[PDB]
Amino acid sequence: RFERIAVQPLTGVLGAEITGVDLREPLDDSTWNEILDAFHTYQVIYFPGQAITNEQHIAFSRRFGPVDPVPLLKSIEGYPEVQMIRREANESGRVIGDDWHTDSTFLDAPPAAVVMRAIDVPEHGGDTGFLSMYTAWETLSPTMQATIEGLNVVHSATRVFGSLDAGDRETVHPLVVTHPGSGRKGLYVNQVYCQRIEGMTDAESKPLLQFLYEHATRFDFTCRVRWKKDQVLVWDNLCTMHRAVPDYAGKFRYLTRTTVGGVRPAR
Amino acid sequence: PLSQRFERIAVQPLTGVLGAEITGVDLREPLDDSTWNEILDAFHTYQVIYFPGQAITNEQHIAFSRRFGPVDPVPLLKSIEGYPEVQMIRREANESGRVIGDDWHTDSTFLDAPPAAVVMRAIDVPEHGGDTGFLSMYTAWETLSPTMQATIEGLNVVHSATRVFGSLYQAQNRRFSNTSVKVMDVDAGDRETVHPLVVTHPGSGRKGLYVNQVYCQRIEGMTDAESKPLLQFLYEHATRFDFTCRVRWKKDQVLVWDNLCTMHRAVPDYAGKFRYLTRTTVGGVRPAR
């Protein structure tokens, strides 16, 4: 299909460049449907050359679902929905999201998707990595799949803003989840928020989660997205993970983002 | 700025770590000294460089490679008819065997003198799928703590091809197709050689980590139980995503990678599709501290 937009897949795993559409304008049914189809298929989609306003950013995001900001990020003045991924040139230390993860999985219902918009990015440096948890799951052997399919995992934010109160609040998600849009099964673990496999001792859980982390972040499951000014990107927060790359010390980097609300991860 | 630093070529870095696209040059022609010198500087800085839209012949491919050093074909790969120097990375659309190089490594480090570089040319590649990953072993070394550097900089590592065409390969079931891979002598596969864990690049003068999970067997003098944790950490460290870059291929793209200070990795995400590149290998000298 794709008659209203042009789609250029980035890899054989995930990622696709979308052109032939103006995000500054309202989307008709046929065009929106094609975009949603590509999103469900390619999991991370990006649109070069979309110099959209804050308002148009929010409006595009709302097409995916309710705009429900992530807890920990700072919003731009006048727009609670639009939050900042900002690093000054002078700034030093460690970068936001510089390990493989997906957003806010300590929530009973984590975000469904994130709409990111490049405002000011370096000519090179500051790529974002993404990976497919569909592919991570599908590449596990049938025996391993059957072995871990019924496991549940305890998530909490203790490492991000917890002790290590709301940061210590635990929630339980299935280890393998069915995407409510695509119907497709994907692996659902991440080293940032996952604490233990429910019901297992530390000795039992640690090596299994460790393998899954190593498996999921295999290089051949990833894609690498380069940013340019006015690039608008949407990632699926359920079936992908992402990673920032701190290879731009001394350079200014500024992107905004809206967060699309989701429902309980379900088996 | 690169635009003013380079006068004969144009350089566009791919990441803040390594990789650069090079334009403004015709690899069909002999390169003059000034143009070659700029290319060599860019190669030393960015470690992996590629030239889009270079529709060259097998002879021109060989001629360009020769600027880097003498041609020295890797033992394992088959060559094309009429050109012993030009070897194949070829995968038929219908084969389902082992994909060549689908783990982080650098080429033929089991050799007493592994390759210095490889010049690879896309012949027929998928529209998407089949990217090659690269990483900088300069960066991998430079990001280790001062204490970890002190701890391991004096170590040596045992290399062999045993898992590629030696006893360990023969004892397992995942085999390469005869498309691009020669039948090999098992004893040659098991032959061990010892290289430093940290080497000095002879062109850049920079220190880089020198270990890879394909060919490295153990730290010299250590038991396997002692070696595995250190080596496993180093593999995990070196292959950190932020130390990598990802190259997408297009027909007639010519790429050169530094076989000493980088590692690379095939990506098997193009099942059912034909993929064919050629490559010439540049001979190196014994890795040294």
Ligand SMILES: C[C@@H](Oc1ccc(Oc2ccc(C#N)cc2F)cc1)C(=O)O
């Ligand atoms: C916005 C996002 O919050 C963050 C904020 C910072 C993040 O960076 C991290 C990277 C690695 C690790 C680890 N291990 C922890 C982090 F907090 C990761 C996620 C979210 O989870 O919704």
Ligand SMILES: C[C@@H](Oc1ccc(Oc2ccc(C#N)cc2F)cc1)C(=O)O
């Ligand atoms: C051509 C090249 O030879 C190869 C051929 C295949 C390679 O891929 C692998 C080989 C063994 C193993 C194992 N065990 C894993 C690999 F990814 C890696 C290198 C070379 O080293 O010169």
Ligand SMILES: O=C(O)CCC(=O)C(=O)O
């Ligand atoms: O800066 C980036 O590339 C991504 C940072 C991140 O993890 C996020 O915005 O959630």
Ligand SMILES: O=C(O)CCC(=O)C(=O)O
């Ligand atoms: O096919 C690739 O992407 C790289 C294969 C490889 O490792 C090699 O040619 O040495």
Ligand SMILES: [Mn+2]
């Ligand atoms: Mn994030």
Ligand SMILES: [Mn+2]
């Ligand atoms: Mn190789």
